[PDB]
Amino acid sequence: ELTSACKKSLVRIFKICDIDGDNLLNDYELNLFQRRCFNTPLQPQILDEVKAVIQKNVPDGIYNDAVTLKGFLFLHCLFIQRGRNETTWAVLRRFGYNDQLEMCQEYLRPPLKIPPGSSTELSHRGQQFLIAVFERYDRDGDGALSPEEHKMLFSTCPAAPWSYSTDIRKSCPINETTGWVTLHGWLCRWTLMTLIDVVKTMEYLAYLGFNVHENDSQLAAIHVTRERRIDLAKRQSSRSVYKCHVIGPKGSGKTGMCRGFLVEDMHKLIGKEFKTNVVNCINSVQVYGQEKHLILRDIDVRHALDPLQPQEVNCDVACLVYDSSNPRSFEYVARIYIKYYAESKIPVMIVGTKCDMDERRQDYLMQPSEFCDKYKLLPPHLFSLKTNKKELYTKLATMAAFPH
Numbered sequence: 001e002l003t004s005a006c007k008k009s010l011v012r013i014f015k016i017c018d019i020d021g022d023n024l025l026n027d028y029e030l031n032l033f034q035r036r037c038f039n040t041p042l043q044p045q046i047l048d049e050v051k052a053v054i055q056k057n058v059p060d061g062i063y064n065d066a067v068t069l070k071g072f073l074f075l076h077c078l079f080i081q082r083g084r085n086e087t088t089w090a091v092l093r094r095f096g097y098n099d100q101l102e103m104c105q106e107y108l109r110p111p112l113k114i115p116p117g118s119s120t121e122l123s124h125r126g127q128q129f130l131i132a133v134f135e136r137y138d139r140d141g142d143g144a145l146s147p148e149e150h151k152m153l154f155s156t157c158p159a160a161p162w163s164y165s166t167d168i169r170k171s172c173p174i175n176e177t178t179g180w181v182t183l184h185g186w187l188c189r190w191t192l193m194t195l196i197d198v199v200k201t202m203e204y205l206a207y208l209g210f211n212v213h214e215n216d217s218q219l220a221a222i223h224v225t226r227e228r229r230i231d232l233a234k235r236q237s238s239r240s241v242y243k244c245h246v247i248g249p250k251g252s253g254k255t256g257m258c259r260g261f262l263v264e265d266m267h268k269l270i271g272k273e274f275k276t277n278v279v280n281c282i283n284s285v286q287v288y289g290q291e292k293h294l295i296l297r298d299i300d301v302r303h304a305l306d307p308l309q310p311q312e313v314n315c316d317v318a319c320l321v322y323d324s325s326n327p328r329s330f331e332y333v334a335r336i337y338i339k340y341y342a343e344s345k346i347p348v349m350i351v352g353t354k355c356d357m358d359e360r361r362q363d364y365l366m367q368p369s370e371f372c373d374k375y376k377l378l379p380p381h382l383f384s385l386k387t388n389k390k391e392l393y394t395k396l397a398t399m400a401a402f403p404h
Ligand SMILES: N[C@@H](CCO)C(=O)O
Pocket: 017, 029, 030, 033, 034, 037, 091
């Protein structure tokens, strides 16, 4: 008696209402989500009468005064019969379903106008929800999601917002022992998505039941920030997520640099080949007592004569990487800083990779140290994976967060 489409909708609602991930709807959530749908508290005897019907008609449907999925599916399968289908509908309606039993548009994609210069970040409520969701699907209680638990978490979605093995595991901080995405990396991946694709973030937040849990639009999960001159405002809006475009020639080792931002032990990537193209890597660094997220975009390598798009040039801080151990490498960095960043307002950092081998002279006119001196840049940051030093990542974020 239950539609195949109706069961698909009801099973998602059960998962969202399952605030413990214990496959049960205990007394608290039943009363909580009662107010979400009907604006009234669940009356004690009504719940008792509901439980009596379930335990009678269907086995393994009630486990310790808590409605199981089967008993929950049956209960609504009952409602549509006895003439009160508007009770089932009011529930489906609150979780963003229309009459054709599809997810509504204005429920998934509410209007959000972002002025140029402004960035989109996760608000406090948005983070709290994402942390809460993370723990319900972390069964081992070790602060990490397995690939199986990751799929379970997005089972209420049409599909995952990203790959587990080819995205979040290579672009975000994971656990060294297990290899699974940590709570930290979880918030990191969402932070990345929120910044560059706010619409997709909100769409996936509704699927996870942010609108119902918070009793508000998913606009309350998005915090619009902007760099602004002093206006003596009450509520400050300073940025916390900075994007860094890493631009360099081929074989300049700028890929292994980005991956090193995600692990403490960097001496496991000395001679590692990356058979996986990660566009954006992300982690956090402390900048003057505050947590700041830095996104390292591995800009596609190309010929020096090949052009560069504004969406590839414009960023918060530009990191130009060359090979100090290669004489025909620095020419690229010199060519690009002049063409795109010489008259730009973007802070630029020149980075010399592989200092643990042999400092070779650059066949270019000026040397890297001389180039920075001329255009008033900081001396070429010596970088290597053997040293395990992460001062560069802290320095990059500090350049983006500050003048000039
Ligand atoms: N669907 C539940 C309330 C919302 O979870 C019920 O009517 O019993």
